[PDB]
Amino acid sequence: TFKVGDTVVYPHHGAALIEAIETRQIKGVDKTYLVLKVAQGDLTVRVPADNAEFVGVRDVVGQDGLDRVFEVLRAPYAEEPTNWSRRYKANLEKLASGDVIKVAEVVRDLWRRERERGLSAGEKRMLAKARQILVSELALAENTNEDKAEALLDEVLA
DNA sequence: TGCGACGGTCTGACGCTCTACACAGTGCCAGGGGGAGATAAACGAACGCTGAACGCTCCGG
């Protein structure tokens, strides 16, 4: 399931690459510890393989991923409650859900409501964070990375 | 009640000046009533314009 030299995406940090496999023991119990790091936060994440599905790691989605994200990115008839408090409580929960599709409609709704009205600048921080984590994710998912990954969105978001 | 002691309470604790200085860890947006501030009009008065008019010294045929 998990190998060395491949890339897997971690929640709240974007995609990352696996360095090697260690044999660290926690609470005196030996575990198959896997270590990986990201270049954004400059932090190393150590997660055992037994609870990898429990902690919520996902592998890189192949061709199936881009077509479904593009289709949802353009889905019309999207509605939200009039009160901003319910949407404010829902957006971070959907971000913490970790689904690529879910964060796709979240960022599409956020971008369209930011362009149509210009809400505020406080929400722009998490908007930019979501944009950064999605462009880091689609770096390996769509096989386009860095500036090329950012460029592809520039003409498909409208 | 008389006793001590235990306790809180309270006060200052000589004097200026050469010198002398400043001060920090936890939300957010929409709707709505005032008032300053730009716009064009408007009430009122006087400020110009029309040369005209009152009246003198005037060079004058």
PDB file of C-alpha atoms (C1' of nucleotides) in Angstrom:
ATOM      1  CA  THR A   1       0.000   0.000   0.000  1.00  0.00           C
ATOM      2  CA  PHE A   2       2.708   2.456   1.077  1.00  0.00           C
ATOM      3  CA  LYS A   3       6.193   2.435  -0.457  1.00  0.00           C
ATOM      4  CA  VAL A   4       9.331   4.600  -0.412  1.00  0.00           C
ATOM      5  CA  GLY A   5       9.977   7.413  -2.880  1.00  0.00           C
ATOM      6  CA  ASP A   6       6.301   7.985  -3.705  1.00  0.00           C
ATOM      7  CA  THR A   7       4.038  10.918  -2.810  1.00  0.00           C
ATOM      8  CA  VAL A   8       0.982  10.903  -0.533  1.00  0.00           C
ATOM      9  CA  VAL A   9      -1.225  13.835   0.481  1.00  0.00           C
ATOM     10  CA  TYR A  10      -1.597  14.756   4.162  1.00  0.00           C
ATOM     11  CA  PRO A  11      -4.510  16.793   5.573  1.00  0.00           C
ATOM     12  CA  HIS A  12      -3.987  20.455   6.528  1.00  0.00           C
ATOM     13  CA  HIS A  13      -0.522  20.404   4.901  1.00  0.00           C
ATOM     14  CA  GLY A  14      -0.941  19.489   1.220  1.00  0.00           C
ATOM     15  CA  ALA A  15       0.931  16.880  -0.765  1.00  0.00           C
ATOM     16  CA  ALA A  16       4.265  15.566   0.491  1.00  0.00           C
ATOM     17  CA  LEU A  17       6.957  13.018  -0.341  1.00  0.00           C
ATOM     18  CA  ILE A  18       8.027  10.048   1.779  1.00  0.00           C
ATOM     19  CA  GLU A  19      11.691  10.016   2.795  1.00  0.00           C
ATOM     20  CA  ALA A  20      12.178   6.539   4.296  1.00  0.00           C
ATOM     21  CA  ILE A  21      10.688   4.022   6.746  1.00  0.00           C
ATOM     22  CA  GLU A  22      11.787   3.985  10.418  1.00  0.00           C
ATOM     23  CA  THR A  23      11.131   1.459  13.262  1.00  0.00           C
ATOM     24  CA  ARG A  24      10.226   3.969  16.041  1.00  0.00           C
ATOM     25  CA  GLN A  25       8.448   2.459  19.097  1.00  0.00           C
ATOM     26  CA  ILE A  26       5.788   4.569  20.925  1.00  0.00           C
ATOM     27  CA  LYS A  27       4.691   3.750  24.538  1.00  0.00           C
ATOM     28  CA  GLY A  28       7.199   0.837  24.453  1.00  0.00           C
ATOM     29  CA  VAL A  29       5.317  -0.772  21.510  1.00  0.00           C
ATOM     30  CA  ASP A  30       7.166  -1.253  18.167  1.00  0.00           C
ATOM     31  CA  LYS A  31       5.298   0.329  15.196  1.00  0.00           C
ATOM     32  CA  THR A  32       5.924   0.508  11.406  1.00  0.00           C
ATOM     33  CA  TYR A  33       6.602   4.280  11.525  1.00  0.00           C
ATOM     34  CA  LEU A  34       6.583   6.164   8.223  1.00  0.00           C
ATOM     35  CA  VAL A  35       8.214   9.595   7.975  1.00  0.00           C
ATOM     36  CA  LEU A  36       7.478  12.317   5.428  1.00  0.00           C
ATOM     37  CA  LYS A  37       8.018  16.064   5.195  1.00  0.00           C
ATOM     38  CA  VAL A  38       6.756  19.043   3.205  1.00  0.00           C
ATOM     39  CA  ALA A  39       8.588  22.106   1.893  1.00  0.00           C
ATOM     40  CA  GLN A  40       5.868  24.555   2.983  1.00  0.00           C
ATOM     41  CA  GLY A  41       5.945  24.358   6.782  1.00  0.00           C
ATOM     42  CA  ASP A  42       9.426  22.772   6.966  1.00  0.00           C
ATOM     43  CA  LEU A  43       8.106  20.099   9.331  1.00  0.00           C
ATOM     44  CA  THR A  44       8.480  16.318   9.422  1.00  0.00           C
ATOM     45  CA  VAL A  45       5.406  14.133   9.971  1.00  0.00           C
ATOM     46  CA  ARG A  46       5.799  10.640  11.453  1.00  0.00           C
ATOM     47  CA  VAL A  47       2.735   8.398  11.093  1.00  0.00           C
ATOM     48  CA  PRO A  48       2.615   4.606  11.601  1.00  0.00           C
ATOM     49  CA  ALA A  49       1.221   2.455   8.812  1.00  0.00           C
ATOM     50  CA  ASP A  50      -1.307   0.611  11.003  1.00  0.00           C
ATOM     51  CA  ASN A  51      -3.347   3.755  11.751  1.00  0.00           C
ATOM     52  CA  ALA A  52      -2.619   5.478   8.422  1.00  0.00           C
ATOM     53  CA  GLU A  53      -6.205   4.933   7.279  1.00  0.00           C
ATOM     54  CA  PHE A  54      -7.436   5.974  10.732  1.00  0.00           C
ATOM     55  CA  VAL A  55      -5.501   9.256  10.819  1.00  0.00           C
ATOM     56  CA  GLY A  56      -6.811  10.018   7.327  1.00  0.00           C
ATOM     57  CA  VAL A  57      -4.054   9.868   4.720  1.00  0.00           C
ATOM     58  CA  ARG A  58      -4.943   9.420   1.050  1.00  0.00           C
ATOM     59  CA  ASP A  59      -2.951   8.322  -1.979  1.00  0.00           C
ATOM     60  CA  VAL A  60      -2.555  10.409  -5.125  1.00  0.00           C
ATOM     61  CA  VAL A  61      -5.629  10.194  -7.350  1.00  0.00           C
ATOM     62  CA  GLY A  62      -4.815   9.553 -11.032  1.00  0.00           C
ATOM     63  CA  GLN A  63      -6.761  10.533 -14.205  1.00  0.00           C
ATOM     64  CA  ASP A  64     -10.171  10.058 -12.486  1.00  0.00           C
ATOM     65  CA  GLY A  65      -9.346  12.973 -10.135  1.00  0.00           C
ATOM     66  CA  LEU A  66      -9.004  15.867 -12.625  1.00  0.00           C
ATOM     67  CA  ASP A  67     -12.221  15.104 -14.609  1.00  0.00           C
ATOM     68  CA  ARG A  68     -14.475  14.998 -11.489  1.00  0.00           C
ATOM     69  CA  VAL A  69     -12.852  18.130  -9.926  1.00  0.00           C
ATOM     70  CA  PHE A  70     -13.310  20.052 -13.229  1.00  0.00           C
ATOM     71  CA  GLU A  71     -16.960  18.866 -13.502  1.00  0.00           C
ATOM     72  CA  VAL A  72     -17.804  20.035  -9.918  1.00  0.00           C
ATOM     73  CA  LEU A  73     -15.737  23.236 -10.494  1.00  0.00           C
ATOM     74  CA  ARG A  74     -18.319  24.112 -13.152  1.00  0.00           C
ATOM     75  CA  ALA A  75     -21.496  22.806 -11.488  1.00  0.00           C
ATOM     76  CA  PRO A  76     -24.239  25.480 -11.612  1.00  0.00           C
ATOM     77  CA  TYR A  77     -27.278  26.062  -9.358  1.00  0.00           C
ATOM     78  CA  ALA A  78     -25.200  26.296  -6.177  1.00  0.00           C
ATOM     79  CA  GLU A  79     -27.116  27.776  -3.242  1.00  0.00           C
ATOM     80  CA  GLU A  80     -26.136  28.846   0.271  1.00  0.00           C
ATOM     81  CA  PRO A  81     -28.111  30.081   3.298  1.00  0.00           C
ATOM     82  CA  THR A  82     -28.688  33.822   3.552  1.00  0.00           C
ATOM     83  CA  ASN A  83     -27.129  34.023   7.021  1.00  0.00           C
ATOM     84  CA  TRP A  84     -23.339  34.161   6.784  1.00  0.00           C
ATOM     85  CA  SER A  85     -22.870  32.466  10.174  1.00  0.00           C
ATOM     86  CA  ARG A  86     -24.031  29.025   9.001  1.00  0.00           C
ATOM     87  CA  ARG A  87     -21.816  29.186   5.903  1.00  0.00           C
ATOM     88  CA  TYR A  88     -18.925  30.392   8.073  1.00  0.00           C
ATOM     89  CA  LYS A  89     -19.422  27.409  10.389  1.00  0.00           C
ATOM     90  CA  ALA A  90     -19.725  25.033   7.425  1.00  0.00           C
ATOM     91  CA  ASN A  91     -16.721  26.097   5.329  1.00  0.00           C
ATOM     92  CA  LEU A  92     -13.997  25.206   7.841  1.00  0.00           C
ATOM     93  CA  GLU A  93     -15.721  21.887   8.569  1.00  0.00           C
ATOM     94  CA  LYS A  94     -15.730  21.100   4.843  1.00  0.00           C
ATOM     95  CA  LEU A  95     -12.064  22.142   4.670  1.00  0.00           C
ATOM     96  CA  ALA A  96     -11.244  19.810   7.580  1.00  0.00           C
ATOM     97  CA  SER A  97     -13.177  17.002   5.866  1.00  0.00           C
ATOM     98  CA  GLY A  98     -10.199  16.678   3.517  1.00  0.00           C
ATOM     99  CA  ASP A  99     -12.076  15.695   0.356  1.00  0.00           C
ATOM    100  CA  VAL A 100     -10.719  17.128  -2.893  1.00  0.00           C
ATOM    101  CA  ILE A 101     -14.227  17.491  -4.333  1.00  0.00           C
ATOM    102  CA  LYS A 102     -15.538  19.209  -1.190  1.00  0.00           C
ATOM    103  CA  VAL A 103     -12.701  21.730  -1.057  1.00  0.00           C
ATOM    104  CA  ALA A 104     -13.286  22.237  -4.795  1.00  0.00           C
ATOM    105  CA  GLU A 105     -16.830  23.540  -4.379  1.00  0.00           C
ATOM    106  CA  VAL A 106     -15.733  25.387  -1.220  1.00  0.00           C
ATOM    107  CA  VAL A 107     -13.058  27.350  -3.079  1.00  0.00           C
ATOM    108  CA  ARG A 108     -15.313  27.870  -6.113  1.00  0.00           C
ATOM    109  CA  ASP A 109     -18.078  29.325  -3.932  1.00  0.00           C
ATOM    110  CA  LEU A 110     -15.561  31.434  -1.995  1.00  0.00           C
ATOM    111  CA  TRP A 111     -14.001  32.795  -5.198  1.00  0.00           C
ATOM    112  CA  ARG A 112     -17.342  33.645  -6.806  1.00  0.00           C
ATOM    113  CA  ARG A 113     -18.683  35.359  -3.672  1.00  0.00           C
ATOM    114  CA  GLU A 114     -15.402  37.247  -3.241  1.00  0.00           C
ATOM    115  CA  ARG A 115     -15.544  38.484  -6.835  1.00  0.00           C
ATOM    116  CA  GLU A 116     -19.251  39.368  -6.885  1.00  0.00           C
ATOM    117  CA  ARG A 117     -19.337  41.368  -3.636  1.00  0.00           C
ATOM    118  CA  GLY A 118     -15.876  41.679  -2.107  1.00  0.00           C
ATOM    119  CA  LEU A 119     -16.693  40.296   1.345  1.00  0.00           C
ATOM    120  CA  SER A 120     -13.669  41.179   3.506  1.00  0.00           C
ATOM    121  CA  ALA A 121      -9.941  40.588   3.946  1.00  0.00           C
ATOM    122  CA  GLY A 122     -10.057  38.370   7.043  1.00  0.00           C
ATOM    123  CA  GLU A 123     -11.472  35.439   5.068  1.00  0.00           C
ATOM    124  CA  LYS A 124      -8.840  36.032   2.364  1.00  0.00           C
ATOM    125  CA  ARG A 125      -6.252  34.334   4.599  1.00  0.00           C
ATOM    126  CA  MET A 126      -8.032  30.977   4.624  1.00  0.00           C
ATOM    127  CA  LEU A 127      -9.059  31.500   0.989  1.00  0.00           C
ATOM    128  CA  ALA A 128      -5.377  31.779   0.035  1.00  0.00           C
ATOM    129  CA  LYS A 129      -4.552  28.812   2.283  1.00  0.00           C
ATOM    130  CA  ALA A 130      -7.184  26.685   0.525  1.00  0.00           C
ATOM    131  CA  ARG A 131      -5.930  27.818  -2.891  1.00  0.00           C
ATOM    132  CA  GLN A 132      -2.351  26.933  -1.925  1.00  0.00           C
ATOM    133  CA  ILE A 133      -3.258  23.485  -0.602  1.00  0.00           C
ATOM    134  CA  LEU A 134      -5.358  22.671  -3.683  1.00  0.00           C
ATOM    135  CA  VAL A 135      -2.625  23.776  -6.089  1.00  0.00           C
ATOM    136  CA  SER A 136      -0.150  21.683  -4.082  1.00  0.00           C
ATOM    137  CA  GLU A 137      -2.515  18.696  -4.288  1.00  0.00           C
ATOM    138  CA  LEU A 138      -3.172  18.960  -8.054  1.00  0.00           C
ATOM    139  CA  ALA A 139       0.618  19.288  -8.541  1.00  0.00           C
ATOM    140  CA  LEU A 140       0.877  15.451  -8.606  1.00  0.00           C
ATOM    141  CA  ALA A 141      -2.834  14.623  -9.189  1.00  0.00           C
ATOM    142  CA  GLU A 142      -3.049  16.414 -12.593  1.00  0.00           C
ATOM    143  CA  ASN A 143       0.700  15.893 -13.409  1.00  0.00           C
ATOM    144  CA  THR A 144       1.091  19.726 -13.647  1.00  0.00           C
ATOM    145  CA  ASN A 145       3.095  21.427 -10.838  1.00  0.00           C
ATOM    146  CA  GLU A 146       4.218  24.879  -9.524  1.00  0.00           C
ATOM    147  CA  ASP A 147       3.545  27.754 -12.003  1.00  0.00           C
ATOM    148  CA  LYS A 148       2.054  25.306 -14.576  1.00  0.00           C
ATOM    149  CA  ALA A 149      -0.470  24.041 -11.956  1.00  0.00           C
ATOM    150  CA  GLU A 150      -1.407  27.668 -11.068  1.00  0.00           C
ATOM    151  CA  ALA A 151      -1.620  28.562 -14.802  1.00  0.00           C
ATOM    152  CA  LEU A 152      -4.091  25.717 -15.602  1.00  0.00           C
ATOM    153  CA  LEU A 153      -6.630  27.134 -13.073  1.00  0.00           C
ATOM    154  CA  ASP A 154      -6.261  30.693 -14.552  1.00  0.00           C
ATOM    155  CA  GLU A 155      -8.492  29.732 -17.515  1.00  0.00           C
ATOM    156  CA  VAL A 156     -10.877  27.082 -16.112  1.00  0.00           C
ATOM    157  CA  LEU A 157     -12.191  28.845 -12.986  1.00  0.00           C
ATOM    158  CA  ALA A 158     -14.711  30.975 -14.913  1.00  0.00           C
TER     159      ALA A 158
ATOM    160  C1'  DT B   1     -15.665  40.845  84.511  1.00  0.00           C
ATOM    161  C1'  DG B   2     -10.516  40.875  84.574  1.00  0.00           C
ATOM    162  C1'  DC B   3      -6.939  38.937  82.366  1.00  0.00           C
ATOM    163  C1'  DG B   4      -3.243  38.669  78.639  1.00  0.00           C
ATOM    164  C1'  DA B   5      -2.191  37.900  74.097  1.00  0.00           C
ATOM    165  C1'  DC B   6      -3.493  37.668  69.652  1.00  0.00           C
ATOM    166  C1'  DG B   7      -4.733  40.248  66.453  1.00  0.00           C
ATOM    167  C1'  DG B   8      -5.554  43.934  62.908  1.00  0.00           C
ATOM    168  C1'  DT B   9      -4.640  48.694  62.117  1.00  0.00           C
ATOM    169  C1'  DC B  10      -2.133  52.551  61.344  1.00  0.00           C
ATOM    170  C1'  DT B  11       1.139  56.200  60.968  1.00  0.00           C
ATOM    171  C1'  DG B  12       5.880  58.241  59.538  1.00  0.00           C
ATOM    172  C1'  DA B  13      10.359  56.668  58.513  1.00  0.00           C
ATOM    173  C1'  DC B  14      16.119  64.730  58.116  1.00  0.00           C
ATOM    174  C1'  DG B  15      16.625  67.707  53.078  1.00  0.00           C
ATOM    175  C1'  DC B  16      17.055  69.944  48.224  1.00  0.00           C
ATOM    176  C1'  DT B  17      19.641  69.000  43.398  1.00  0.00           C
ATOM    177  C1'  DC B  18      23.972  67.706  39.612  1.00  0.00           C
ATOM    178  C1'  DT B  19      21.302  63.479  38.075  1.00  0.00           C
ATOM    179  C1'  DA B  20      15.427  62.416  36.043  1.00  0.00           C
ATOM    180  C1'  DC B  21      12.566  57.193  32.185  1.00  0.00           C
ATOM    181  C1'  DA B  22      10.068  54.311  30.367  1.00  0.00           C
ATOM    182  C1'  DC B  23       6.570  50.646  29.972  1.00  0.00           C
ATOM    183  C1'  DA B  24       4.053  44.423  26.322  1.00  0.00           C
ATOM    184  C1'  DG B  25      -0.260  37.168  25.648  1.00  0.00           C
ATOM    185  C1'  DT B  26      -6.938  34.878  22.767  1.00  0.00           C
ATOM    186  C1'  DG B  27     -14.206  36.724  16.570  1.00  0.00           C
ATOM    187  C1'  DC B  28     -17.214  38.627  12.836  1.00  0.00           C
ATOM    188  C1'  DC B  29     -20.487  40.809   9.295  1.00  0.00           C
ATOM    189  C1'  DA B  30     -24.824  42.671   7.775  1.00  0.00           C
ATOM    190  C1'  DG B  31     -28.556  46.394   8.262  1.00  0.00           C
ATOM    191  C1'  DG B  32     -29.723  51.098   9.399  1.00  0.00           C
ATOM    192  C1'  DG B  33     -29.886  56.259  11.104  1.00  0.00           C
ATOM    193  C1'  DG B  34     -26.814  61.011  11.059  1.00  0.00           C
ATOM    194  C1'  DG B  35     -23.938  64.400   9.237  1.00  0.00           C
ATOM    195  C1'  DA B  36     -20.436  65.977   7.558  1.00  0.00           C
ATOM    196  C1'  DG B  37     -19.372  66.985   2.786  1.00  0.00           C
ATOM    197  C1'  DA B  38     -20.426  68.167  -2.811  1.00  0.00           C
ATOM    198  C1'  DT B  39     -24.146  70.050  -6.532  1.00  0.00           C
ATOM    199  C1'  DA B  40     -27.291  73.258  -8.953  1.00  0.00           C
ATOM    200  C1'  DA B  41     -30.765  76.299  -8.220  1.00  0.00           C
ATOM    201  C1'  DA B  42     -32.676  80.455  -6.153  1.00  0.00           C
ATOM    202  C1'  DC B  43     -34.022  85.178  -3.277  1.00  0.00           C
ATOM    203  C1'  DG B  44     -32.112  89.462  -2.797  1.00  0.00           C
ATOM    204  C1'  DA B  45     -29.377  93.436  -3.498  1.00  0.00           C
ATOM    205  C1'  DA B  46     -25.953  96.258  -5.792  1.00  0.00           C
ATOM    206  C1'  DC B  47     -22.905  96.954  -9.402  1.00  0.00           C
ATOM    207  C1'  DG B  48     -22.381  98.122 -14.278  1.00  0.00           C
ATOM    208  C1'  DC B  49     -24.169 100.128 -18.542  1.00  0.00           C
ATOM    209  C1'  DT B  50     -27.106 103.227 -21.372  1.00  0.00           C
ATOM    210  C1'  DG B  51     -25.200 107.712 -22.601  1.00  0.00           C
ATOM    211  C1'  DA B  52     -28.148 111.539 -21.141  1.00  0.00           C
ATOM    212  C1'  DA B  53     -28.399 115.846 -18.820  1.00  0.00           C
ATOM    213  C1'  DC B  54     -26.917 120.248 -15.949  1.00  0.00           C
ATOM    214  C1'  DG B  55     -23.665 123.838 -16.631  1.00  0.00           C
ATOM    215  C1'  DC B  56     -19.495 125.961 -16.839  1.00  0.00           C
ATOM    216  C1'  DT B  57     -15.302 128.170 -19.459  1.00  0.00           C
ATOM    217  C1'  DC B  58     -14.373 128.285 -23.728  1.00  0.00           C
ATOM    218  C1'  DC B  59     -12.138 129.637 -28.817  1.00  0.00           C
ATOM    219  C1'  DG B  60     -15.014 131.401 -31.938  1.00  0.00           C
ATOM    220  C1'  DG B  61     -16.927 132.880 -36.550  1.00  0.00           C
TER     221       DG B  61
END
